[PDB]
Design a protein around this ligand. Structure first.
Ligand code: HEM
Ligand code: G0M
Length: 451
């Protein structure tokens, strides 16, 4: 301190920071709105300060590719640290440098296409649970809260695809597992006071409610020593050139996968159903495609899901509008130059995906939900370093193909059986949480009718 002269020195523009707070008061309307304003106010690069922490936003695609792919191992290896994390330091998305590289290797084969194909039957079964739970509300002409019913399904897939546990968490009961996973303003104080992280790490306050972590640490070792197709097994089989996965490390990845696949899968489904309800022609076109590929509500398979091109377009265009990461970030670990621009050590480089996905300079009518932008005709004109809903380079979303498959199997089975209509209580137009997550302000409620 005061680092608040850094961008002024390098001649990079940006909004003037306030002492101690940097630019964070500018987050009051949300990260996303701030990034769009900076994009329009300042052009291709700009800097700002989370507290004392310099953040350099970059929007040039070549420069993005340099940061995410070309210089990843050498410079831009880690994300911005947050805490306190406790033992979750060993989790893949949080770990750093060689320890992350290791964990990436031990977990990468778990997410192959081949392994994903063997997970489809198990992921198929809970699609049926999803329909029946939906019908009980469709037969009772009462509006439905999608996040609840989609969460129940996403919850259902996680416990099965990661541990073998099998529940209908929606109704079926207070089964011992649904509840510790229920615990599925503090994080802002971190940024003005990031020097308090090591404080909280010697105090063992875990952002992961220390009890849940205590529940699964023992829960895993119950499962481990009971067996001795799912993620736990795929990881246990792995610990049988890198030191094998420890027993606590395995747990920490389990936790990351539960987090990853719960509110992401559920929220993206809710975003998709909102678009399909408020664009009835897309919904019908999708329903026809599904009936053409799977006549008589034939059960979807891995191969038939990959066959559905309009399904893919609907999914991709939704992710354009609602990229739930909002931003991609890498810590600069060395003095470097990329594409004719100096970057000093310790700067956080940030790619503002939300802003890039809704930038008129690449997207016509960016606010409109228009699946055709992803027609095999048009999909080729889309810069992969502008549309980046799963990141890019060695540190992109490891769960990407699982998550696309998991969501699509849900949609297919659901669209075979129901149509989705707006209720008077639907928020139209949907608004984003002014807060820190990409979620709707009010939850998505829609009318559900049986075909
Ligand atoms: C639609 C759902 C999802 C989306 C849009 C999504 C998106 C992302 C994005 C944008 C990143 C950052 C990548 C980067 O910085 O370049 C990421 C990281 C990650 N995601 Fe996902 N994700 C989703 C679901 C999942 C699921 C289901 C898993 C299951 C395990 C998962 C596991 C991970 C992991 C482990 C990382 C950290 C990768 C690493 O640091 O090596 N994600 N995800
Ligand atoms: C800005 C603040 C500090 C408020 O919260 C974050 O920093 N939020 C996370 C960073 S840990 C994240 C999820 C998580 C893990 C433990 C406890 C809560 C949450 C994780 O790794 N989840 C797997 C995942 C999540 C979403 C998409 N795909 C994969 C979000 C994150 C986004 C992209 C890459 C890595 C992390």
């Amino acid at each position: 301190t005061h680092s608040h002269g850094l961008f002024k020195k390098l001649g990079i523009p940006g909004p003037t920071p306030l002492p101690f707070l940097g630019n964070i008061l500018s987050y009051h309307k949300g990260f996303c709105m701030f990034d769009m304003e900076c994009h329009k106010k300042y052009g291709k690069v700009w800097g700002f300060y989370d507290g004392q922490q310099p953040v350099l936003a970059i929007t040039d695609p070549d420069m993005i590719k340099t940061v995410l792919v070309k210089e990843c191992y050498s410079v831009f290896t880690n994300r911005r640290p947050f805490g306190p994390v406790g033992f979750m330091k060993s989790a893949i998305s949080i770990a750093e440098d060689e320890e992350w590289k290791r964990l990436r290797s031990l977990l990468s084969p778990t997410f192959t296409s081949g392994k994903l194909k063997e997970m489809v039957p198990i992921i198929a079964q809970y699609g049926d649970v999803l329909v029946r739970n939906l019908r009980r509300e469709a037969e009772t002409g009462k509006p439905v809260t999608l996040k609840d019913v989609f969460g129940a399904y996403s919850m259902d897939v996680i416990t099965s695809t990661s541990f073998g546990v099998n529940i209908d968490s929606l109704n079926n009961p207070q089964d011992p597992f649904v509840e510790n996973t229920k615990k599925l303003p503090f994080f802002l104080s971190i940024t003005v006071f990031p020097f308090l992280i090591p404080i909280l790490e010697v105090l063992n306050i875990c952002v992961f409610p220390r009890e849940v972590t205590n529940f699964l640490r023992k829960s895993v070792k119950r499962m481990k020593e009971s067996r001795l197709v799912d993620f736990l097994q795929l990881m246990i089989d792995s610990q049988n050139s890198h030191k094998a996965l420890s027993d606590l490390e395995l747990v920490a990845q389990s936790i990351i996968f539960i987090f990853a696949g719960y509110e992401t899968t559920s929220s993206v489904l809710s975003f998709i159903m909102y678009e399909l309800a408020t664009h009835p022609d897309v919904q019908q076109k999708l329903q026809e495609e599904i009936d053409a590929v799977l006549p008589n509500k034939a059960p979807p398979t891995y191969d038939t899901v990959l066959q559905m091109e309009y399904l893919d377009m609907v999914v991709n265009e939704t992710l354009r509008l609602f990229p739930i990461a909002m931003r991609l970030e890498r810590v600069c670990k060395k003095d470097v130059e990329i594409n004719g621009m100096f970057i000093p050590k310790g700067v956080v480089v940030m790619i503002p995906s939300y802003a890039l996905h809704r930038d008129p300079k690449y997207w016509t009518e960016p606010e409109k939900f228009l699946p055709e932008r992803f027609s095999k005709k048009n999909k080729d004109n889309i810069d992969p370093y502008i549309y980046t809903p799963f990141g890019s380079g060695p540190r992109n979303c490891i769960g990407m193909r699982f998550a696309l498959m998991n969501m699509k199997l849900a949609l297919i089975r659901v669209l075979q059986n129901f149509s989705f209509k707006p209720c008077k209580e639907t928020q139209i137009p949907l608004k984003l949480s002014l807060g820190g997550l990409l979620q709707p302000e009010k939850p998505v409620v829609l009318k559900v009718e049986s075909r």
